[PDB]
Amino acid sequence: YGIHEEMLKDKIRTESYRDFIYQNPHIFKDKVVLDVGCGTGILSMFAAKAGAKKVLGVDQSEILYQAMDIIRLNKLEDTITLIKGKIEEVHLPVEKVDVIISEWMGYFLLFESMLDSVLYAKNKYLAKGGSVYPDICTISLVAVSDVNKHADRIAFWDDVYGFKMSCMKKAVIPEAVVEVLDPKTLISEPCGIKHIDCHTTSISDLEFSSDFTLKITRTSMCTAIAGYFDIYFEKNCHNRVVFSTGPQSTKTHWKQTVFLLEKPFSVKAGEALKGKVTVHKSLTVTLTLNNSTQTYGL
Amino acid sequence: YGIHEEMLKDKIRTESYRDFIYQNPHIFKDKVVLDVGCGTGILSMFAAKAGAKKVLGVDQSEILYQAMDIIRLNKLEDTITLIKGKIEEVHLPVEKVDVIISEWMGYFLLFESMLDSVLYAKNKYLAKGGSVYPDICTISLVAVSDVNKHADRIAFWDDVYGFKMSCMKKAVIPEAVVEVLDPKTLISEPCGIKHIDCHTTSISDLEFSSDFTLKITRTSMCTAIAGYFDIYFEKNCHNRVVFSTGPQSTKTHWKQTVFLLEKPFSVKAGEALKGKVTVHKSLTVTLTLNNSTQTYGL
Ligand SMILES: O=C(NCC(=O)c1ccccc1)Nc1ccc2nnsc2c1
Ligand SMILES: O=C(NCC(=O)c1ccccc1)Nc1ccc2nnsc2c1
């Protein structure tokens, strides 16, 4: 229940979806809409208000029972039908749908995300000429300098209340951190490492490699690499909607994902820093930079 | 691994144990010490430095493997022996111990606490005339007024992006919240509801009822009841050690536990507010106040 309240209070997330739906009613007017992982059913109710003919909300979680009561309190049961279960298992009362909407995104976009479900739903249920929203996603990396925070996580273990705990460093390094970053600590321009169009993407496309270049903007000690993602509502929209989960933008519940570097190294403003990143499916992230390679998990 | 780092950075917690051990070396000098749920082994190393003859550190968790390396880095393996497993299952290389030390405390003292293990260890392994530390614990309640935070959790659901979500209130109310309270929001003197001496306490004593009286100190709307605990190191100490996890004291990782009231009600400064609390074994907490009864869990 906690997460749903948090997600609803995430204004950037929820109002982006609201605006997309309300400002593009033509996408919904008299349409059949599927809401994959509907939670409390908020997106389905948006879709109904924007003039959807039928809305099907699917979720495996016990939140669905609350969704049912919520739909009744708003007198929408004649438009919105809720079904408990995994999208891959449930039986729908229609063969095809016109529009798929979902808030599926995880930390670093892909960690524990529902994208597999959305893609499954797209392939089985989306009608010819149909649409999936949000339709476009990108992932970006950005270099960080924060010697003090690095010291708090790493050098910290050298002397703990007068005792050596150095071996613990090996255990902190592989754990990606979900946290809001001070944007002043960013020492490079961002670099996109992934672009996903939900209309063309397959499940195999979610495991990917990318070479990247970080355009350094401040001479400093690089201590970590941060990742985040942008969400776009584009196809057939008169009013496009974008939101970023990056540190230069208002915080969201996704915050940013931080991959700590074991051995910080100096960089110079104007320098082009090259590395390589690979994502495998929980998810892991393999980072090569400055001739070090580390695999991270969440 | 995260929790252990957090616990080590909890200065109030860790330095209280450090001071108790270092400032009362007579309790440890040439003694056999058992450390129940030893984690990284920090308390065992304190005990060794204070002059323990042998220290046995027990933990079921994979952190024990790190503890082993930590003990070696500090060259303490001739004094400290670590054993993986539950205290109720493992075989010890001694029949009896002189001193038991443990950091076992949970949120609201008893939520997911290791006290059962400590009591088991006391009964099976503590020698006649031996000691357990910390030896004394208390739990306290205190009344809270925070109409704004109450509105953020409850009235919030009346209108969510133009839709009714009132039914969700029933789901938020029973969930106790772990959070640091602004001490200005406290509207009563604290009232102790439980006193535990680890030398005399049994497992059945941890399920308890208490009538309480809250001495109201500010005329206001009571919106929640908060709970916390105090830890005492007393038996045979020349230098006693106390720490509180209450909101009038420096925050600890235990923060405070907050039980929201569904129907806030007004109180007057000087008023003696009577209620009843009962704890059952996860743990639940049943609260009667102002002729309402609610059971809470974590
Ligand atoms: O590592 C964290 N946060 C996690 C943290 O403080 C923590 C504390 C106790 C237990 C586990 C994690 N943040 C962070 C942010 C930016 C950074 N830049 N260079 S290193 C670094 C670390
Ligand atoms: O309820 C919370 N905190 C939990 C919270 O803000 C939250 C936010 C999103 C999801 C789950 C919990 N705190 C709190 C503190 C003091 C109070 N006094 N009267 S009501 C009250 C609530």
Automatic annotation (TrEMBL), chains A, B:
First-tier enzyme category under EC: transferase
Gene encoding the protein: PRMT3
Chemical reaction(s) catalysed: L-arginyl-[protein] + S-adenosyl-L-methionine = N(omega)-methyl-L-arginyl-[protein] + S-adenosyl-L-homocysteine + H(+); L-arginyl-[protein] + 2 S-adenosyl-L-methionine = N(omega),N(omega)-dimethyl-L-arginyl-[protein] + 2 S-adenosyl-L-homocysteine + 2 H(+)
Major place of residence: cytoplasm
Keywords from the named record: Acetylation, Cytoplasm, Metal-binding, Methyltransferase, Nucleus, Phosphoprotein, S-adenosyl-L-methionine, Transferase, Zinc, Zinc-finger
Cell membrane as UniProt keyword: no
TM segment ranges: none
UniProt organism field: Homo sapiens (Human)
Enzyme Commission number: 2.1.1.319
Subcellular location: Cytoplasm, Cytosol; Nucleus
Protein name from the UniProt record: Protein arginine N-methyltransferase 3
Whole-protein coverage range: 244 to 547 of 548
